[PDB]
Amino acid sequence: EYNNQNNFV
């Protein structure tokens, strides 16, 4: 299981 999340402001 590969879980990924990213935020760019």
mmCIF file of C-alpha atoms in Angstrom:
data_model
loop_
_atom_site.group_PDB
_atom_site.id
_atom_site.type_symbol
_atom_site.label_atom_id
_atom_site.label_comp_id
_atom_site.label_asym_id
_atom_site.label_seq_id
_atom_site.Cartn_x
_atom_site.Cartn_y
_atom_site.Cartn_z
ATOM 1 C CA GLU A 1 0.000 0.000 0.000
ATOM 2 C CA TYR A 2 1.358 3.395 -1.223
ATOM 3 C CA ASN A 3 -0.296 6.519 0.289
ATOM 4 C CA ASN A 4 0.750 10.028 -0.952
ATOM 5 C CA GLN A 5 -0.568 13.617 -0.572
ATOM 6 C CA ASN A 6 1.062 17.060 -1.160
ATOM 7 C CA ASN A 7 -0.034 20.738 -0.949
ATOM 8 C CA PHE A 8 1.596 23.722 -2.784
ATOM 9 C CA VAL A 9 0.496 27.251 -1.885
#
